[PDB]
């Protein structure tokens, strides 16, 4: 239930100085944090969709859950990424 | 790193662990792939503050634990990094 450790590690490496190192257990920690992030947002969206008797978690439900939970700054880059992904 | 490389099937599998998730739209995993890249990058940068504050150049799990305590947006990781 985790994203591939090499992808997580590549994103981490791009964030720190080129000379820095990342311990294996820190890559594994971030791997777990990512999965919890996805589950945390999904839980918020899924409760809302249930309250509204809707059977599909849509993109707006994920974005709204992110906005509610402190990640409103993600909404605009995600919309742009999705639009560009589909164009 | 290109966000398109993240496996959408794995993101969907994680979402599907939720007890109230029935169907998921096609776009939801795509949005989470980009969100994952933003989240990892910000968390790593915030942990690296503590790496350097401790006069180290290796990012360690304790640095991530400290970063989580210093940003409200990471409050939800309280049990993941104890």
């Amino acid at each position: 239930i985790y994203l591939p450790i090499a992808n997580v590690a590549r994103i981490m490496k791009n964030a720190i100085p080129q000379t820095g190192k990342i311990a294996k257990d820190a890559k594994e920690c971030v791997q777990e944090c990512v999965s919890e992030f996805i589950s945390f947002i999904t839980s918020e969206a899924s409760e809302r969709c249930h309250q509204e008797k809707r059977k599909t978690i849509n993109g707006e439900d994920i974005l709204f859950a992110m906005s509610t939970l402190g990640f409103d700054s993600y909404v605009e880059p995600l919309k742009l990424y999705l639009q560009k992904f589909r164009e | 790193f290109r966000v398109q490389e993240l496996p959408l099937a794995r993101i969907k599998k994680i979402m599907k662990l939720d007890e109230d998730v029935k169907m998921i739209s096609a776009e939801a995993p795509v949005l989470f792939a980009k969100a994952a890249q933003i989240f990892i990058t910000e968390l790593t940068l915030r942990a690296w503050i503590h790496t350097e504050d401790n006069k180290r150049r290796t990012l360690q799990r304790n640095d991530i634990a400290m970063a989580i305590t210093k940003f409200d947006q990471f409050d939800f990781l309280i049990d993941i990094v104890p």
């Binding site: 589950s39 945390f40 918020e44 509610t68 939970l69 402190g70 | 409050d75 309280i78 049990d79």
Partner: peptide, 13 residues
Amino acid sequence: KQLHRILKRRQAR
């Protein structure tokens, strides 16, 4: 902002 969702996620985990 996250507190109620955290309490809930703990039961799910």
